[PDB]
Symmetry: D2
Subunit: 125 residues, 4 copies
């Protein structure tokens, strides 16, 4: 119900509020880059997905949000062995025309694996 690429990423949303969105997912064989770790683009795509879900839910019927930019740091290699990742988008700024959200991706232990900042534009009715 969130689009076909989000389905392919395997994201499962636990919460989508106007102030927070949370999704679980896992590293998979088809999501890896040649040396057995998660392709970095997957981290960016998950950050984009989780922040966009939250931004959309915050704007509500007032308009539609369009991605502007995405800056993601990869802090640790993620593999299939690492189990279930949790990505949490938190608001940084939510105004008339712009939103910025911060998305942290952590493992079961709370180790920060990746983190991204997502700027989106509000297309208001």
């Amino acid at each position: 119900r969130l689009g076909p690429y989000v389905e392919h990423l395997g994201l499962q949303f636990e919460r989508i509020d106007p102030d927070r969105a949370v999704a679980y997912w896992s590293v998979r064989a088809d999501l890896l880059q040649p040396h057995g770790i998660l392709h970095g683009g997957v981290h960016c795509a998950v950050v984009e997905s989780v922040a966009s879900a939250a931004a959309d839910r915050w704007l509500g019927d007032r308009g539609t949000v369009v991605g502007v930019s995405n800056s993601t740091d990869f802090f640790a290699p993620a593999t299939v062995a690492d189990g279930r990742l949790t990505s949490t988008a938190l608001p940084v700024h939510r105004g008339a025309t712009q939103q910025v959200w911060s998305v942290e991706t952590v493992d079961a232990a709370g180790r920060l694996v990746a983190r991204g900042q997502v700027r989106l534009h509000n297309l208001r009715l």
Copy 2:
């Protein structure tokens, strides 16, 4: 031969030199976000892929490269109607421990659709 996620993205590399990498690809139905345009994470993933290919080819047998960060701007909506996209990674800095590459994604007309900067770490032998 470039990994399973790169295959899923549909990237077709035309050139992978130590100083430039070029890949073609297209927007597809399964790569879209709910309102019929390319999911933004796909832009980031392609930027990551094309820059990593170039960085790897520049480091050669001297070591291996690991993604550090990825900052991608999305400048225009891309749809299935927009045809074939061309992503070109050009070097910004290539040193002992770090590389930075700049990747521009353009349409057939030369319209810049997205652009990303990719920082990678050199793990040398």
Copy 3:
């Protein structure tokens, strides 16, 4: 005691711990850009200063830190009328070779005026 540019910025540090640094400062006539608001570079410089102070204090005698990159968003115009700004650097990642800190600059009301992410390299002994 923090360098001549930090002095020129007018930063006054309230706290410099291995896990947090806090500085106060104010918009001034000489820090403005042509239309009476704070020059954006001042926001970046303050973010750099406050994060570097914290990173240095966390690395301690173990080595020295060198700025790598600085990404600052400006969310609201700051003027002389806006009074005293408070910049707080919080750790995102602190590892062997790299540190990342997040610096928020707020006004008296808690309005977020600017926010920056600072990546630094640890040059260890």
Copy 4:
């Protein structure tokens, strides 16, 4: 004629066209951070200044530009010994509401010392 902070930075503009701006400047004792190299915020401030000059000149009488964000990488330490730096802003995207410019700061040899991407908003009449 470009504001008081730009004056303090010592920037001297050689060219300000709608498609390029070029300024010269030098590392100075008061611009340094505690270990004798250029404070990183100075690099960001120069990137902001040179890109804003170009963006303003491109928008012309049509409106006014406001800084949105600034992402600067520092690639080599700059000192007083390094002589005259040249900062060149080139356009990445110039549209209805947004502009993005890329600013490279080089030394006399063409060594890239720092590079920044500056996003600005067009406030049109």
